[PDB]
Structures are given as C-alpha cells and as structure tokens.
Amino acid sequence: CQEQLKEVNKTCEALLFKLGEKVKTLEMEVAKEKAVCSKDKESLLAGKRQTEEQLEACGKARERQQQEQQVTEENLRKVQSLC
Amino acid sequence: LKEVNKTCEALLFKLGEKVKTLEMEVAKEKAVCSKDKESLLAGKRQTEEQLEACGKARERQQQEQQVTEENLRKVQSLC
C-alpha cells in the first residue's frame, strides 16, 4: 500500500516537473524578449529625437541665411539707385 | 496520500493553462515589438531624409549668398 501510492505519485510528479521546465523556459524567453525590445525601442526613440533636434537646428540656420540674403538683396536695390 | 496525487493532477491542469498563456504572450510580444520598431525606423528614416534635404538647401543658399554678395561688391566698386 505504501509502495503503490509512492509509485503512482512518482509518475505524476515527474510529468509535473517535465512541464514545469517548459513554464520556466517560457518565462525566461518572455523576460529576455521584453528587455531586448524595450532597450531597442528606447534607443530608436532617442535616435529619432536627436535627428529631430538636428533638423530643427538646420531649419534655424536656413532662416538666418535667408535673413542675410534679404539684407544683401536690399543693399543692391538701394545702391543701384545711386549708380 | 491520495491527497498529494490529487494536488499533483490539479496542478497539471493549471500548468497547461499557464503554458498556453505564456506561448500566446511570446507570440504577441514578438509581433508587437516587430511592428513598433518598423514604425520607429520609418519615423527615423523620414526625419533623416528631411535633415538631408535641409542640408542640401542650406548649401544651395550659401552659394546664392556668394553670388549676390559679389554682385553687391561689383555694383558698389563700379558705382
């Protein structure tokens, strides 16, 4: 009676741990993927925000060159009226 | 001792549910990650091409500044 109930249970527990290892494998796979994903997305977000700041600075340098161009063009119009 | 085998069998069912929940989470997270990084890459590549076009316009303006500045000098020099 003692050896029979122990043999029955050894079989159930051994299946329980075989499946227990699949749960552990899947829990680590989830943890790994979430860490690599979130790290890669934070990196891409930081990268596009850096390009947006460069695009902003480039746009601002184009505004300055256009102010300078208008000043030079106005100087032509004005000096041409004296020559 | 029938008691301990009942708890083992009840856990086999709970672990089947947990395995399926985890297999679905793996599949879903992989698919959501893939389309989020494709969206961020497309966003980053659209800004990089705008940065490139701005840079080309910025050099096209400095060359038009060289032309207009020398024409101003020519007109003032020969006034």
Residue numbers in the entry:
A (entry chain C): 4 to 86
B (entry chain D): 8 to 86
Question: What did the published study say regarding this structure?
Answer:
The microscopic openings across the walls of many capillaries contain a protein mesh that is formed by the extracellular domain (ECD) of plasmalemma vesicle-associated protein (PLVAP). Current evidence suggests that a single transmembrane protein, plasmalemma vesicle-associated protein (PLVAP or PV1), constitutes the diaphragm’s sole structural protein. PLVAP is a type II transmembrane protein of ~60 kDa with an ~390-amino acid C-terminal extracellular domain (ECD), a single transmembrane domain, and a 26-amino acid N-terminal cytoplasmic domain. The three-dimensional structure of PLVAP CC1 presented here shows that it forms a parallel disulfide-bonded dimeric coiled coil.
